[PDB]
Each structure stands twice: as C-alpha cells, then as structure tokens.
Design an enzyme around this catalytic site. Structure first.
Site, mmCIF file in Angstrom:
data_model
loop_
_atom_site.group_PDB
_atom_site.id
_atom_site.type_symbol
_atom_site.label_atom_id
_atom_site.label_comp_id
_atom_site.label_asym_id
_atom_site.label_seq_id
_atom_site.Cartn_x
_atom_site.Cartn_y
_atom_site.Cartn_z
ATOM 1 N N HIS A 41 38.182 0.799 22.410
ATOM 2 C CA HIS A 41 38.873 0.272 24.286
ATOM 3 C C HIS A 41 38.922 -0.994 24.777
ATOM 4 C CE1 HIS A 41 38.837 4.038 26.854
ATOM 5 N NE2 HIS A 41 39.227 4.299 25.524
ATOM 6 N N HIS A 162 37.533 11.081 16.459
ATOM 7 C CA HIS A 162 37.202 12.176 17.877
ATOM 8 C C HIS A 162 36.537 13.150 16.291
ATOM 9 C CE1 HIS A 162 39.905 11.132 21.308
ATOM 10 N NE2 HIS A 162 39.070 10.908 20.999
ATOM 11 N N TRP A 178 34.196 16.945 19.821
ATOM 12 C CA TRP A 178 35.579 18.448 19.213
ATOM 13 C C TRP A 178 35.567 18.630 17.488
ATOM 14 C CZ3 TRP A 178 35.078 13.422 21.633
ATOM 15 C CH2 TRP A 178 36.560 13.425 22.200
ATOM 16 N N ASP A 207 45.076 15.192 21.379
ATOM 17 C CA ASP A 207 44.895 15.902 19.904
ATOM 18 C C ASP A 207 46.030 16.749 19.231
ATOM 19 O OD1 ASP A 207 42.516 14.754 20.502
ATOM 20 O OD2 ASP A 207 42.178 15.693 21.555
HETATM 21 C C1 HEM Z 1 45.173 8.686 20.716
HETATM 22 C C2 HEM Z 1 44.969 9.256 21.731
HETATM 23 C C3 HEM Z 1 43.444 9.126 23.064
HETATM 24 C C4 HEM Z 1 43.204 9.287 23.697
HETATM 25 C C5 HEM Z 1 44.118 9.708 24.535
HETATM 26 C C6 HEM Z 1 41.634 9.020 24.428
HETATM 27 C C7 HEM Z 1 40.907 9.924 25.344
HETATM 28 C C8 HEM Z 1 39.158 10.207 24.898
HETATM 29 C C9 HEM Z 1 39.197 10.499 25.773
HETATM 30 C C10 HEM Z 1 40.380 11.039 27.336
HETATM 31 C C11 HEM Z 1 37.483 11.027 25.798
HETATM 32 C C12 HEM Z 1 36.909 11.210 26.899
HETATM 33 C C13 HEM Z 1 35.904 9.742 27.180
HETATM 34 C C14 HEM Z 1 34.419 10.710 28.099
HETATM 35 O O1 HEM Z 1 35.095 11.292 28.955
HETATM 36 O O2 HEM Z 1 33.288 10.390 27.113
HETATM 37 C C15 HEM Z 1 37.787 10.416 24.141
HETATM 38 C C16 HEM Z 1 35.966 9.549 24.558
HETATM 39 C C17 HEM Z 1 36.263 9.525 22.451
HETATM 40 N N1 HEM Z 1 36.936 9.354 22.142
HETATM 41 FE FE1 HEM Z 1 39.171 8.182 22.659
HETATM 42 N N2 HEM Z 1 41.002 8.413 22.280
HETATM 43 C C18 HEM Z 1 41.891 8.300 22.163
HETATM 44 C C19 HEM Z 1 41.763 7.445 20.594
HETATM 45 C C20 HEM Z 1 40.322 6.876 20.298
HETATM 46 C C21 HEM Z 1 40.659 6.375 19.408
HETATM 47 C C22 HEM Z 1 42.002 4.941 18.328
HETATM 48 C C23 HEM Z 1 39.681 6.305 19.013
HETATM 49 C C24 HEM Z 1 38.441 5.417 18.050
HETATM 50 C C25 HEM Z 1 38.690 5.138 16.566
HETATM 51 C C26 HEM Z 1 38.447 6.893 19.632
HETATM 52 C C27 HEM Z 1 37.363 6.840 20.326
HETATM 53 C C28 HEM Z 1 36.711 7.914 20.622
HETATM 54 C C29 HEM Z 1 35.681 8.520 20.634
HETATM 55 C C30 HEM Z 1 33.901 7.969 19.435
HETATM 56 C C31 HEM Z 1 34.831 9.397 21.784
HETATM 57 C C32 HEM Z 1 33.478 9.790 22.408
HETATM 58 C C33 HEM Z 1 33.210 8.334 22.989
HETATM 59 C C34 HEM Z 1 31.335 9.863 23.484
HETATM 60 O O3 HEM Z 1 30.650 10.042 22.510
HETATM 61 O O4 HEM Z 1 30.848 8.980 24.466
HETATM 62 N N3 HEM Z 1 39.738 7.495 20.887
HETATM 63 N N4 HEM Z 1 38.650 9.450 24.079
#
Ligand code: HEM
Ligand SMILES: [K+]
EC number: 1.11.1.11
Length: 249
Positions: A41, A162, A178, A207
């Site tokens: 982010h 994810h 996931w 996804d």
């Molecule tokens: C492709 C478009 C993406 C969308 C629409 C998206 C959307 C989201 C959403 C809605 C969450 C949940 C947040 C929560 O409620 O805690 C999330 C979590 C997460 N995202 Fe993504 N994301 C994207 C791409 C990415 C990318 C590019 C990365 C890093 C390489 C990433 C890494 C993560 C990780 C690691 C979490 C887990 C965080 C936790 O466990 O607290 N995501 N994402």
C-alpha cells in the site's frame, strides 16, 4: 532503467542491521502479511504520468492512514516504530520497503533484491489509487498498468501476495485467509483459485478476475503448476513495485 543512488557506508550498515532485526521481529509477531500489505500500500499509489505517490514514506502520515483502503495499517506503522527508532539514519521509505522484502523472506518466499536510497517525501498522494476488490481485469490494468506502469505478468504474480494473510471484516469487510497455510509463502493462492471455492477460504472478485481474463489465466495456470516460476516472477514484480518512482520511475 534504474540508477540507484549512492548511500554512505553507515547507511548500508544500518540496512543490513535493520534487515536482521526485522526478520526476528516480524517472525516473532506473526505479522508478515500485514507488513507486506503496508509495503504494497505504500508503493501502490504511484502514478507514472505525474510521478506522484509511491514508496516514499508517506503512509505513516495520519492523512494517508485514514484512507479506507488502509484500514488496519496504523497497527503496522505502530508495531514498527520502536524498531525504526533504533535506525534513525534510515528513511521511513526504505524501512517500510525493507519490511516488505523481509516479510516475504521469513515466510519462505523468494529473496527480493533491495536497493536503499528512497527519500521521505512531504505530501501523501490523493486517496483512491489502490485497487478495488470488487472490480475486475480492466480495473486491475488501469491501476497496475496505466497508473503504476507494471505489466500484466506483474499483476498476476503480485496477486499471489495473498498467499499469505487474511482479510478482516472490521478492516476491508472481507473475511478470512486465501490459503490453508497463510503464514507460508507458496503458490497455494493459485492452486486454491483454480480448484473452486473451498469452505473457509476467501476469494475476492479481483482474484477471480484473473481466472477469466485471457492473458491472466495462462499465468495463473503456470504459477499453480510451477512454484519456482511463481517465485521468479514474484521476485521481479515485487522489486519493481518497491522501486516505483525511485531511481527512475
Ligand atoms: C490485485 C489487487 C488487490 C486487491 C484488490 C487487494 C485487496 C485486498 C483486500 C480487500 C485485503 C483485505 C484487507 C483486510 O481486510 O485485512 C487484502 C489483504 C492483503 N493483501 Fe491485497 N489486494 C491486491 C493486491 C495485493 C498485492 C499486490 C499484494 C502484495 C504483493 C497484496 C498483499 C496483501 C496481503 C499480504 C493481505 C493480508 C494482510 C493481513 O493478513 O493482514 N495484495 N487485499
Ligand atoms: K500460503
């Protein structure tokens, strides 16, 4: 086309020191997914046309933390502040990207190359640049491609981030991991995506968009069949992400 800045020997020593302490801290706190999210982010706000946003330390600003896309990341920022204070020579910009690289490494993922030198910039970008989970492939290319300047291959590989972590209904509103092994960096995100929805496991509309796009779907299949290929493409994409606007764009 990157030309990395020169940093002093003392700066490089702090990078190496900080990298080790970040391993220990992130492994102990079981917060790798959240730290990866904080790094992503931070970087994902870059807009190539204006050269604004990007991984320049602004996410710790309360105005940027307040973005709804960043719900929950103030926890991350707070968690890191004591360690960051042990490394006053480092920029926050470098520190957060280093935490992201370390989060992938300590969960068993690839070693993403790290170059120091990002400066902390004064103004956070406007809100609304990070991807919307409820949208699809055109949206993803608008954000990763037209704004950040990343490739279609980069989009699918980075989506594999994810493979660790979960959503939380009090943060995004989505809920759950996931994968069955959400502190283990592997290609499981793609194998679950292919197999159908299994009870207990999460799939965002963003996804699922990968499965029906003609360019994205062959990459999902590749990664599901070949974790080494995933790791290679992931490492390339994360480095590029972490370097947007830095050492040239
Ligand atoms: C492709 C478009 C993406 C969308 C629409 C998206 C959307 C989201 C959403 C809605 C969450 C949940 C947040 C929560 O409620 O805690 C999330 C979590 C997460 N995202 Fe993504 N994301 C994207 C791409 C990415 C990318 C590019 C990365 C890093 C390489 C990433 C890494 C993560 C990780 C690691 C979490 C887990 C965080 C936790 O466990 O607290 N995501 N994402
Ligand atoms: K996993």
């Amino acid at each position: 086309g990157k030309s990395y800045p020169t940093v002093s020997a003392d700066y490089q020593k702090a990078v190496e020191k900080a990298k080790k302490k970040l391993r220990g801290f992130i492994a102990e706190k079981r917060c790798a997914p959240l730290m990866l999210r904080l790094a992503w982010h931070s970087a994902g706000t870059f807009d190539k046309g204006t050269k604004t946003g990007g991984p320049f330390g602004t996410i710790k600003h309360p105005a940027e933390l307040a973005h709804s896309a960043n719900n929950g990341l103030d926890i991350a920022v707070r968690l890191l502040e004591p360690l960051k204070a042990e490394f006053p020579i480092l920029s926050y910009a470098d520190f957060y990207q280093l935490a992201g690289v370390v989060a992938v490494e300590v969960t068993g993922g690839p070693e993403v190359p790290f170059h120091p030198g990002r400066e902390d910039k004064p103004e956070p970008p406007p809100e609304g640049r990070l991807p919307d989970a409820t949208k699809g492939s055109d949206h993803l290319r608008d954000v990763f491609g037209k704004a950040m300047g990343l490739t279609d291959q980069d989009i699918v590989a980075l989506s594999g981030g994810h493979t660790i972590g979960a959503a939380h209904k009090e943060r995004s509103g989505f809920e759950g991991p996931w994968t069955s092994n959400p502190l283990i960096f592997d290609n499981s995100y793609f194998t679950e995506l292919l197999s159908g929805e299994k009870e207990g496991l999460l799939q965002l509309p963003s996804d699922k968009a990968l499965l029906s796009d003609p360019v994205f779907r062959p990459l999902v299949d590749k990664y599901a069949a070949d974790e080494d290929a995933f790791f290679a493409d992931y490492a390339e994409a994360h480095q590029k992400l972490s370097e947007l606007g830095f050492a040239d764009a």
